[PDB]
Design a protein around this ligand. Structure first.
Ligand code: HEM
Ligand SMILES: CCCCc1nc(Cl)c(CO)n1Cc1ccc(-c2ccccc2-c2nn[nH]n2)cc1
Ligand SMILES: CCCCc1nc(Cl)c(CO)n1Cc1ccc(-c2ccccc2-c2nn[nH]n2)cc1
Ligand SMILES: [K+]
Length: 463
């Protein structure tokens, strides 16, 4: 049958007993009772939860194809959210994902590499930092721009100026949708009502914000159709139009202008907020543990010097910095339950049978915070990624990107962003707090699965 769970009440399921304030903890509490595989009910739709490395691994990896579905919630439909990569399934997903991974290969869109676009953004980020002239500063915004401009460059070949109103407009919409999408009312509560949309104004705001962004993308597309050069694809859209020309005589086809739009919005969405937030917390953690900072800096000075930019080759000569970046992601656990999965067919799992179409919830927390792979997993300590001689120590428990067939598409892109932005900031600046290090809180604030950092200010002191 289904794995066992705590008894649900007719209709509301186990709903009125979950800590919507911190679902992760709730899951972890239950696991304390029902073990690593347990069942829950969300107003009648069963959801199997997987907790702990073993169960996540043999699910996502060993039965990878079977667990490769994306769980669908009303919201997916309420915000027209299932038409690109993140919220797709079947043929559509496989085709668009696979093509998207090929095109975001470092050298997948022409002679200009992804690393080179990031490298440029690292320089612009540092310039903007300088322009603050060491005065206090809330970097929430700037750190939001950098990644966004990276997605822009990957998709439009254009980067913007931190003050180009056009950019500032896009950011705003992005930021609005993100903040909205992050409300518990929208993520959870509204997904109890499968038929009735209880927040129509909101979904309407979301959709309008989407339309503005799709409409802007469609302008770029036109500009790209007129300037096409079949031997010199320069960005994601180029590649996507070329794949379209190849699918001519393969209709109906997954690749259309509609899907390009939807895929591009997914990319803007997914490639801007999580990185941005990871960087924003990273700076905060570095203010709090300034001996970590000084160690990153000793590595940078010695391996990279100050003449040139950091580049990805340096990361292998910088085991301590790399440990720092890993540990930031492990410690933050920014997507504690990944995104929802669904089984792709009827399956046997351990003692139990899971019927095709059942939502699966992966507790990334339980892997990231394994208190044996990572002693005192709730403390920030880069030593969790270092061996006895201060060499880099990999961990099969390092899944901030999830695992298996759905592993984040931006995994390599996030990794370049973090390493190059962080090392470029710390190459050109020291960090200074207002309040005393040993004072401010670095523990993630969390909501509707939402993980945000407190407000804080700091100064960027030129080196
Ligand atoms: C630190 C930054 C990031 C983290 C921690 C992160 C993490 C994740 C996670 C946990 C998933 C869900 C995997 C699952 O379905 O089980 C995911 C999916 C995804 N991420 Fe990221 N991500 C990050 C940045 C990015 C970036 C920069 C992009 C750029 C394109 C991106 C694009 C995606 C996409 C498209 C998916 C959907 C994959 C699919 O369902 O096939 N992410 N990410
Ligand atoms: C109905 C079509 C209007 C669409 C829309 N475009 C934008 Cl732009 C605005 C700003 O509020 N809006 C309206 C708006 C109205 C109230 C909400 C909202 C805010 C907080 C808590 C619940 C509500 C809500 N949403 N739907 N019903 N009540 C959000 C969007
Ligand atoms: C102006 C456009 C902003 C981005 C955007 N707004 C809308 Cl509505 C969509 C539909 O998915 N999207 C695409 C989307 C894809 C992934 C996310 C995402 C980003 C960081 C952290 C969590 C999520 C998320 N979205 N849903 N569940 N988790 C946000 C937006
Ligand atoms: K209303």
């Amino acid at each position: 049958k289904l794995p066992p769970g705590p008894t649900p009440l007719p209709v509301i399921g186990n709903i009125l007993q979950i800590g919507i304030k911190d679902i992760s903890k709730s899951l972890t509490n239950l696991s304390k009772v029902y073990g690593p595989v347990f069942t829950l009910y969300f107003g009648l739709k069963p959801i199997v939860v997987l907790h702990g490395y073993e169960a996540v691994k043999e699910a996502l990896i060993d039965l990878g194809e079977e667990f490769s579905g994306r769980g669908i919630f009303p919201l997916a439909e309420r915000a027209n959210r299932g038409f690109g990569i993140v919220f797709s399934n079947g043929k559509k997903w496989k085709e668009i994902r696979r093509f998207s991974l090929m095109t975001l290969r470092n050298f997948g869109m022409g002679k200009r590499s992804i690393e080179d676009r990031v490298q440029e953004e690292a320089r612009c980020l540092v310039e903007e930092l300088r322009k603050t002239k060491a005065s206090p500063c809330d970097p929430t915004f700037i750190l939001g721009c950098a990644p966004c401009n990276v997605i822009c460059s990957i998709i439009f070949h254009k980067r913007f100026d931190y003050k180009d109103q056009q950019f500032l407009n896009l950011m705003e919409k992005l930021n609005e949708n993100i903040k909205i999408l992050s409300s518990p009312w929208i993520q959870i509560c509204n997904n109890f009502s499968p038929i009735i949309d209880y927040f129509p104004g909101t979904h309407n705001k979301l959709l309008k914000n989407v339309a503005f962004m799709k409409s802007y993308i469609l302008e770029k597309v036109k500009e790209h159709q007129e300037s096409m050069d079949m031997n010199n694809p320069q960005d994601f859209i180029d590649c996507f139009l070329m794949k379209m020309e190849k699918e001519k005589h393969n209709q109906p086809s997954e690749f259309t202008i509609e899907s390009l739009e939807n895929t591009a919005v997914d990319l803007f969405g997914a490639g801007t907020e999580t990185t941005s937030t990871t960087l924003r917390y990273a700076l905060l953690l570095l203010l709090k543990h300034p001996e970590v900072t000084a160690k990153v800096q000793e590595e940078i000075e010695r391996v990279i010097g100050r003449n040139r930019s950091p580049c990805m080759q340096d990361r292998s000569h910088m085991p301590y910095t790399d440990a720092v970046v890993h540990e930031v992601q492990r410690y933050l656990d920014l997507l504690p339950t990944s995104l929802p999965h669904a089984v792709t067919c009827d399956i046997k799992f351990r003692n139990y049978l899971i019927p095709k179409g059942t939502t699966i919830l992966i507790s990334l927390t339980s892997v990231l915070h394994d208190n044996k792979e990572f002693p005192n997993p709730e403390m920030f300590d880069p030593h969790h990624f270092l061996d006895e001689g201060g060499n880099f120590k990999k961990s099969k428990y390092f899944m901030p990107f999830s695992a298996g067939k759905r592993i984040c598409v931006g995994e390599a892109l996030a990794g370049m962003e973090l390493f190059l932005f962080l090392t470029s900031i710390l190459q050109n600046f020291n960090l200074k707090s207002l309040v005393d290090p040993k004072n401010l809180d670095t523990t993630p604030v969390v909501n509707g699965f939402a993980s945000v950092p407190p407000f804080y200010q700091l100064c960027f002191i030129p080196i």
